[PDB]
Amino acid sequence: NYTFRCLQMSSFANRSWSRTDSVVWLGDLQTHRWSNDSATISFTKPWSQGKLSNQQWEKLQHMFQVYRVSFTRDIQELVKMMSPKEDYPIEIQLSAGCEMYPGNASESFLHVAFQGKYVVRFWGTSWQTVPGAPSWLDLPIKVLNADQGTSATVQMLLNDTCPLFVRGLLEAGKSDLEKQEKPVAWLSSVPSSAHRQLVCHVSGFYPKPVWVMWMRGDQEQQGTHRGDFLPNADETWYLQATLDVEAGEEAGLACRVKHSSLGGQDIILYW
Amino acid sequence: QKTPQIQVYSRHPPENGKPNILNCYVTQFHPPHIEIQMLKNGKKIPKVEMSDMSFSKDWSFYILAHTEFTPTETDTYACRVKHASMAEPKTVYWDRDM
Amino acid sequence: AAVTQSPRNKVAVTGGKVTLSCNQTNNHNNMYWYRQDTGHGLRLIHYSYGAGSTEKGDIPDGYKASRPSQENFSLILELATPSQTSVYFCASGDEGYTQYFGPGTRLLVLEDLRNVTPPKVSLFEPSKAEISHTQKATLVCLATGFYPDHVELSWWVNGKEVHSGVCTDPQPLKEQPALNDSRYSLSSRLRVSATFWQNPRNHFRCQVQFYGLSENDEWTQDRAKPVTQIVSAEAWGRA
Amino acid sequence: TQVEQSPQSLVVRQGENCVLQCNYSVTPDNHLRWFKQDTGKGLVSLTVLVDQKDKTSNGRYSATLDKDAKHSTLHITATLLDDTATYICVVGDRGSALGRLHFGAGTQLIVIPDIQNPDPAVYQLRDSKSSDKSVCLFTDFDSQTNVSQSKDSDVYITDKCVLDMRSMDFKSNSAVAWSNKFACANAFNNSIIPEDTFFPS
Ligand SMILES: CCCCCCCCCCCCCCCCCCCCCCCCCC(=O)N[C@@H](CO[C@H]1O[C@H](CO)[C@H](OCc2ccc(C(C)(C)C)cc2)[C@H](O)[C@H]1O)[C@H](O)[C@H](O)CCCCCCCCCCCCCC
Ligand SMILES: *[C@@H]1O[C@H](CO[C@@H]2O[C@@H](C)[C@@H](O)[C@@H](O)[C@@H]2O)[C@@H](O[C@@H]2O[C@H](CO)[C@@H](O)[C@H](O)[C@H]2NC(C)=O)[C@H](O)[C@H]1NC(C)=O
Ligand SMILES: *[C@@H]1O[C@H](CO)[C@@H](O[C@@H]2O[C@H](CO)[C@@H](O)[C@H](O)[C@H]2NC(C)=O)[C@H](O)[C@H]1NC(C)=O
Ligand SMILES: *[C@@H]1O[C@H](CO)[C@@H](O)[C@H](O)[C@H]1NC(C)=O
Ligand code: NA
Ligand code: NA
Ligand code: NA
């Protein structure tokens, strides 16, 4: 199952100044970038056009080019309309795309956040507010839902274009999507409010699923704390696993790493 | 206005004298306007590469800075961030042991 | 969904204050002011998304907008200039794209009011030669000596306005085309059947609404103040 | 401008068809409206076109829109005198109140009325109050005839003007002449008037 996510972030500093920047993800791989400074959407993979013909891509891009300009003016007009309820600066984020399931099934979504809070989605044939959203948004929703042309275009974009485009991406991008990159590990230590803290560093692995445990022989140390997954710049992952121990208790300890890329040959590092 | 988390880590196992890549991962901030610098001995490294800014499930922003570096016994490396959520710039030093 | 404008016609002097009003009983949030000048499409001056909101359009300079209520949207010319001589259109709408336009307001801004003069109106009765030759009867109305050219000429039979059988000159003509501020003349015809003209219960009236000075306007000349007024001339049918 | 109309003006005879053009660069183009504006009057909507390739009709008016070419035409079938007007193309850039309207500058149509049964004549009419004052009425000439402005500075002559007696289905041209000086025999000497013009007395 892969989630395709188009992420738009728009800053409005005052009546005149604004910028809109977009990134596109298929799972955890970036497929597109669209900087405010650029007239055109940039591919960040050789296969970013999917299975769309040049004419189909050109047509899709043109729709987005009109959208970006139109969006910018509409927000500025909605601010005037709700004035002085809402003032600049304003941040609007959109998260749109589809999740792909087996058997040619998918679900599409278009979620909108205002000043960092999810307030609005497109659902069915119209815009709606979601639970918790402020009441003033009822007027913008009324205005947005008057635009039958936008509703018809968005319906087609979510229902048809997104899944068709993404199915093509999954075919074209298969060998990047299914890449296996091996982790490399190393050990280190620091003090921690006392006691020592051993660190097992694991870096360069893809895809994300990984297993890392501190161990004495065959005894999995239950005090092992996995950190967050941190990205490397080359579309691999970094993770560290810590263990709090007593000074002089380090002997016997090892760090074991399981990953799909190692083909059963685990990494074992003895302190 | 959420306050930025800063995590500094090397791409490869660090070895004094060996070229490597240093990453600075800034997360959980908003609004998205931010200044990120990577420092060698408190001096701004030139030609630092930035990823495109993105955001998470929870709508908070994140971005990855990275730069080539050669660790040594003597030289200090840090990532310094200015963001409206903070009165002063925050500096997080690279510690190879962490 | 109806929209009205007042005044419908205004003669003003440079430096004076002019207010154009638009009223709208549709409970529309949104109202819009435009001007129409020959050689251009309508151009947006100011608009409003509700009471208290005013927003600059494409050509706001020299105009102030005011939206005191849902019903009323005003365009205020604080210091009127000749460049603001135009036809002004107000419109209203709800969340939908349709703008419902008012009937328009004609504004003329003169440099000076010294030459403003109301018309004399005369009604000329049908020739008996026409009646015997055609079994039709043409009345002619003549408005003369007026300045500027902001007049509306209409025909009334027994207290009700008539349009059928009418034609009014598209433009007033200048009485002294050599002179800078020539006075104007305008003619209109009303043609009816001979039997209609011959019926002595038929009362015919030609009316000219003249637009000139207001009550508020200063007047320093000896002659009567040439205010906005109706001048008319009438005749009864007869055998 | 982003909305251009062609022709700028045209003259047609009653009963003829004509076609008016609108070309625009407005983006996006949600809908296109045609207005009719009679002299000194307001805007009367004739049709609105909304589809990528659209066709509409409204009596003798029909219209097309091609959003790919950014082009619209308005067709008037069998023109009548009352079609004399300015015809205005407007493009709305949104399907909601967030839209701006982009107005073309308009096309002026003049329709020359068809005078079936001419009977050119010059009549004298007397003032209702002071019978010493009069005007001369040149009437019932066909649209071939042109009325020329005045020779003397003290003599006034109006342009021709068609009236329409609707209940009788009857139209007639006329022009008016008067002077502070002057007889109706001599009033329209500066005009090429028909030979069979009736001068009574
Ligand atoms: C999303 C899935 C995409 C997957 C495939 C593509 C993947 C490839 C990489 C893509 C990279 C792009 C990155 C961007 C990512 C984020 C994008 C997600 C947002 C998508 C929204 C797309 C909206 C498209 C439409 C648009 O631009 N509307 C805009 C232009 O509309 C005008 O032009 C159109 C021309 O297509 C139509 O006119 C043509 C028309 C007329 C009639 C008809 C009929 C069939 C009915 C006769 C049809 C057509 C319209 O009617 C006309 O009004 C319109 O201005 C919208 O309002 C823009 C904003 C929409 C989003 C609003 C979000 C909600 C914000 C809430 C804010 C509240 C804050 C208040 C303070
Ligand atoms: C597009 O599909 C929707 C229903 O799908 C949901 O909403 C989409 C925008 C997308 O997010 C999907 O993944 C969702 O599952 C259709 O909406 C229905 O339309 C009918 C009549 O048009 C209406 O009676 C239903 O109530 C709608 N369903 C809901 C949940 O509101 C829509 O018609 C489809 N449009 C086209 C053009 O295919
Ligand atoms: C983001 O991109 C938009 C669109 O290109 C920029 O808006 C344009 O800015 C230029 C230069 O200031 C103006 O001449 C144009 O009128 C603007 N275009 C439109 C369509 O309005 C905007 O300035 C960019 N934002 C930033 C902060 O650079
Ligand atoms: C609007 O915001 C920008 C960016 O914050 C700022 O630099 C600029 O001074 C502002 N412009 C105006 C006209 O106020
Ligand atoms: Na006045
Ligand atoms: Na104009
Ligand atoms: Na006659």
PDB file of N, CA, C and O in Angstrom, chain D residues 102-127:
ATOM      1  N   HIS D 102     -14.603  40.920 -16.846  1.00  0.00           N
ATOM      2  CA  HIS D 102     -13.754  41.586 -17.816  1.00  0.00           C
ATOM      3  C   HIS D 102     -14.630  41.978 -19.012  1.00  0.00           C
ATOM      4  O   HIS D 102     -15.125  41.103 -19.737  1.00  0.00           O
ATOM      5  N   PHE D 103     -14.870  43.278 -19.172  1.00  0.00           N
ATOM      6  CA  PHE D 103     -15.820  43.791 -20.160  1.00  0.00           C
ATOM      7  C   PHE D 103     -15.089  44.175 -21.448  1.00  0.00           C
ATOM      8  O   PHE D 103     -14.106  44.895 -21.412  1.00  0.00           O
ATOM      9  N   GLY D 104     -15.618  43.728 -22.583  1.00  0.00           N
ATOM     10  CA  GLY D 104     -15.241  44.286 -23.864  1.00  0.00           C
ATOM     11  C   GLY D 104     -15.859  45.668 -24.033  1.00  0.00           C
ATOM     12  O   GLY D 104     -16.801  46.032 -23.310  1.00  0.00           O
ATOM     13  N   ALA D 105     -15.334  46.428 -24.997  1.00  0.00           N
ATOM     14  CA  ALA D 105     -15.735  47.805 -25.230  1.00  0.00           C
ATOM     15  C   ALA D 105     -17.008  47.887 -26.084  1.00  0.00           C
ATOM     16  O   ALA D 105     -17.527  48.964 -26.279  1.00  0.00           O
ATOM     17  N   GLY D 106     -17.485  46.768 -26.635  1.00  0.00           N
ATOM     18  CA  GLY D 106     -18.769  46.731 -27.305  1.00  0.00           C
ATOM     19  C   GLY D 106     -18.670  46.897 -28.814  1.00  0.00           C
ATOM     20  O   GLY D 106     -17.684  47.407 -29.339  1.00  0.00           O
ATOM     21  N   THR D 107     -19.712  46.421 -29.501  1.00  0.00           N
ATOM     22  CA  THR D 107     -19.932  46.601 -30.941  1.00  0.00           C
ATOM     23  C   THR D 107     -21.218  47.418 -31.118  1.00  0.00           C
ATOM     24  O   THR D 107     -22.244  47.034 -30.576  1.00  0.00           O
ATOM     25  N   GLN D 108     -21.164  48.521 -31.873  1.00  0.00           N
ATOM     26  CA  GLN D 108     -22.385  49.317 -32.195  1.00  0.00           C
ATOM     27  C   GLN D 108     -23.019  48.806 -33.497  1.00  0.00           C
ATOM     28  O   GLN D 108     -22.389  48.822 -34.560  1.00  0.00           O
ATOM     29  N   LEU D 109     -24.259  48.324 -33.391  1.00  0.00           N
ATOM     30  CA  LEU D 109     -25.080  47.912 -34.511  1.00  0.00           C
ATOM     31  C   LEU D 109     -26.119  49.002 -34.804  1.00  0.00           C
ATOM     32  O   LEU D 109     -26.831  49.436 -33.892  1.00  0.00           O
ATOM     33  N   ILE D 110     -26.208  49.425 -36.070  1.00  0.00           N
ATOM     34  CA  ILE D 110     -27.329  50.227 -36.540  1.00  0.00           C
ATOM     35  C   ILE D 110     -28.102  49.414 -37.584  1.00  0.00           C
ATOM     36  O   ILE D 110     -27.507  48.890 -38.517  1.00  0.00           O
ATOM     37  N   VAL D 111     -29.425  49.320 -37.407  1.00  0.00           N
ATOM     38  CA  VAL D 111     -30.315  48.640 -38.356  1.00  0.00           C
ATOM     39  C   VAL D 111     -31.155  49.696 -39.080  1.00  0.00           C
ATOM     40  O   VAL D 111     -31.916  50.414 -38.448  1.00  0.00           O
ATOM     41  N   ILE D 112     -31.024  49.756 -40.408  1.00  0.00           N
ATOM     42  CA  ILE D 112     -31.796  50.680 -41.243  1.00  0.00           C
ATOM     43  C   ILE D 112     -33.185  50.096 -41.465  1.00  0.00           C
ATOM     44  O   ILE D 112     -33.326  48.987 -41.970  1.00  0.00           O
ATOM     45  N   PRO D 113     -34.261  50.832 -41.108  1.00  0.00           N
ATOM     46  CA  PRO D 113     -35.617  50.301 -41.229  1.00  0.00           C
ATOM     47  C   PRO D 113     -36.053  50.276 -42.702  1.00  0.00           C
ATOM     48  O   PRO D 113     -35.622  51.110 -43.493  1.00  0.00           O
ATOM     49  N   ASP D 114     -36.879  49.288 -43.041  1.00  0.00           N
ATOM     50  CA  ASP D 114     -37.404  49.095 -44.386  1.00  0.00           C
ATOM     51  C   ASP D 114     -38.732  49.853 -44.496  1.00  0.00           C
ATOM     52  O   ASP D 114     -39.713  49.454 -43.892  1.00  0.00           O
ATOM     53  N   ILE D 115     -38.733  50.966 -45.238  1.00  0.00           N
ATOM     54  CA  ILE D 115     -39.931  51.790 -45.460  1.00  0.00           C
ATOM     55  C   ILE D 115     -40.636  51.312 -46.739  1.00  0.00           C
ATOM     56  O   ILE D 115     -40.166  51.580 -47.838  1.00  0.00           O
ATOM     57  N   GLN D 116     -41.777  50.638 -46.571  1.00  0.00           N
ATOM     58  CA  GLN D 116     -42.485  49.956 -47.671  1.00  0.00           C
ATOM     59  C   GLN D 116     -43.105  50.990 -48.620  1.00  0.00           C
ATOM     60  O   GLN D 116     -42.806  51.003 -49.813  1.00  0.00           O
ATOM     61  N   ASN D 117     -43.949  51.860 -48.053  1.00  0.00           N
ATOM     62  CA  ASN D 117     -44.878  52.700 -48.792  1.00  0.00           C
ATOM     63  C   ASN D 117     -44.560  54.169 -48.532  1.00  0.00           C
ATOM     64  O   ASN D 117     -45.303  54.847 -47.823  1.00  0.00           O
ATOM     65  N   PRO D 118     -43.460  54.715 -49.098  1.00  0.00           N
ATOM     66  CA  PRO D 118     -43.101  56.115 -48.872  1.00  0.00           C
ATOM     67  C   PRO D 118     -44.117  57.102 -49.476  1.00  0.00           C
ATOM     68  O   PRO D 118     -44.817  56.773 -50.430  1.00  0.00           O
ATOM     69  N   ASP D 119     -44.163  58.310 -48.905  1.00  0.00           N
ATOM     70  CA  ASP D 119     -45.107  59.359 -49.276  1.00  0.00           C
ATOM     71  C   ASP D 119     -44.491  60.693 -48.860  1.00  0.00           C
ATOM     72  O   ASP D 119     -45.047  61.430 -48.048  1.00  0.00           O
ATOM     73  N   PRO D 120     -43.297  61.035 -49.394  1.00  0.00           N
ATOM     74  CA  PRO D 120     -42.529  62.173 -48.889  1.00  0.00           C
ATOM     75  C   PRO D 120     -43.334  63.479 -48.958  1.00  0.00           C
ATOM     76  O   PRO D 120     -43.950  63.760 -49.986  1.00  0.00           O
ATOM     77  N   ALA D 121     -43.313  64.252 -47.863  1.00  0.00           N
ATOM     78  CA  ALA D 121     -44.052  65.512 -47.767  1.00  0.00           C
ATOM     79  C   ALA D 121     -43.405  66.447 -46.744  1.00  0.00           C
ATOM     80  O   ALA D 121     -42.660  66.020 -45.852  1.00  0.00           O
ATOM     81  N   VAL D 122     -43.706  67.735 -46.890  1.00  0.00           N
ATOM     82  CA  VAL D 122     -43.248  68.750 -45.958  1.00  0.00           C
ATOM     83  C   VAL D 122     -44.479  69.506 -45.461  1.00  0.00           C
ATOM     84  O   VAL D 122     -45.178  70.123 -46.235  1.00  0.00           O
ATOM     85  N   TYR D 123     -44.729  69.422 -44.152  1.00  0.00           N
ATOM     86  CA  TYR D 123     -45.890  70.039 -43.535  1.00  0.00           C
ATOM     87  C   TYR D 123     -45.435  71.174 -42.616  1.00  0.00           C
ATOM     88  O   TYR D 123     -44.320  71.151 -42.083  1.00  0.00           O
ATOM     89  N   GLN D 124     -46.311  72.171 -42.459  1.00  0.00           N
ATOM     90  CA  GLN D 124     -46.112  73.226 -41.498  1.00  0.00           C
ATOM     91  C   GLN D 124     -47.005  72.947 -40.286  1.00  0.00           C
ATOM     92  O   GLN D 124     -48.183  72.613 -40.441  1.00  0.00           O
ATOM     93  N   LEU D 125     -46.412  73.044 -39.089  1.00  0.00           N
ATOM     94  CA  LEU D 125     -47.122  72.844 -37.818  1.00  0.00           C
ATOM     95  C   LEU D 125     -47.040  74.142 -37.011  1.00  0.00           C
ATOM     96  O   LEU D 125     -45.978  74.748 -36.946  1.00  0.00           O
ATOM     97  N   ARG D 126     -48.145  74.527 -36.363  1.00  0.00           N
ATOM     98  CA  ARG D 126     -48.198  75.780 -35.612  1.00  0.00           C
ATOM     99  C   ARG D 126     -48.123  75.488 -34.106  1.00  0.00           C
ATOM    100  O   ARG D 126     -48.607  74.471 -33.643  1.00  0.00           O
ATOM    101  N   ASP D 127     -47.476  76.403 -33.376  1.00  0.00           N
ATOM    102  CA  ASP D 127     -47.301  76.349 -31.921  1.00  0.00           C
ATOM    103  C   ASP D 127     -48.675  76.371 -31.238  1.00  0.00           C
ATOM    104  O   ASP D 127     -49.555  77.109 -31.649  1.00  0.00           O
TER     105      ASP D 127
END
